[PDB]
């Protein structure tokens, strides 16, 4: 769990299709949208935690996606002071959805985190995510862009 620096180890998930779009999910009972992310549990590899949270939050199996890329280093963001674990450090994965859209299901776990989802244009998340994640999102999308665009060519 939380290390000496106060950062929760965490995985984030960018799911794309072959049309230049990424999966944008609406936080349960809120108005804000974001990518799936979740904490790495003790004893888990990052990839393991990614596939677990992928099913918990989005209903998808390993069999429904393929991993296209991951970020090389932890990306860190600090929580707003009033919203306090002082932050999260994240490994990000780029997944292509190869099964049908209908496989996405926000209710496979007993604690759903999203109401639902839609496809959005590739550069929509950077300016739509909550302010304190923007710098991480900017970096993530920059690292993933060439791969997503190659699928859309």
Ligand X SMILES: Nc1ncnc2c1ncn2[C@@H]1O[C@H](COP(=O)(O)OP(=O)(O)OP(=O)(O)OP(=O)(O)OC[C@H]2O[C@@H](n3cnc4c(N)ncnc43)[C@H](O)[C@@H]2O)[C@@H](O)[C@H]1O
**Contact residues for Mg ion (CB under 5 A)?**
37-39, 53, 57, 113
Contact call for residues 53 and 152 (beta carbons, < 8 A): no
- Under rule CB under 6 A, residue 32 binds ligand X: yes
Please report, for residues 71, 86, 124, 133, the alpha-carbon distance to residue 146 in angstroms, rounded to integers and kept in the order given: 13, 32, 16, 21
Provide the b/e sequence for 121-134 (b: ≥16 CB within 10 Å).
Answer: ebeebbeebeeebe
Interface residue with ligand X among 9, 22, 37, 95 (CB under 6 A) is 37
* φ and ψ of 60, to 5 deg: -100, 145
- Under rule CB under 6 A, residue 71 binds ligand X: no
Residue with tokens 């496809």: 119
Interface residue with ligand X among 46, 130, 145, 147 (CB under 6 A) is 130
Which is nearer to ligand X, 9 or 97 (by Cβ)? Answer: 9
Distance CA 121, CA 102 (A): 19
Q: Mark 81-120 with x for binding to ligand X (rule: CB under 6 A) and - for no binding.
A: --x----x------------------------x-------
| Contact set for Cl ion, span 11-40 (CB under 5 A) | 18
Binding site for Cl ion (CB under 5 A): 18
- By CB under 6 A, name the binding residues for ligand X: 10, 32, 37-39, 53, 79, 83, 88, 113, 130
């Amino acid at each position: 769990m939380i290390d000496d620096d106060g950062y929760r180890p965490n995985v984030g998930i960018v799911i794309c299709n072959r049309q230049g779009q990424v999966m944008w999910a609406r936080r349960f009972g809120q108005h804000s949208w974001q990518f799936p992310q979740g904490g790495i549990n003790p004893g888990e590899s990052a990839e393991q935690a990614m596939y677990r949270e992928l099913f918990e939050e989005v209903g998808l199996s390993r069999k429904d996606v393929r991993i296209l890329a991951s970020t090389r280093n932890w990306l860190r963001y600090k929580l707003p002071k009033r919203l306090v674990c002082i932050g999260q450090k994240q490994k990000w994965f780029l997944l292509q959805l190869v099964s049908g859209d209908a496989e996405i299901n926000m209710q496979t776990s007993s604690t759903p985190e999203f109401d639902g989802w839609r496809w959005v244009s590739y550069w929509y998340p950077v300016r739509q995510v909550v302010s304190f994640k923007r710098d991480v999102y900017r970096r993530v999308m920059k690292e993933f862009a060439s791969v997503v665009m190659s699928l859309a060519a």
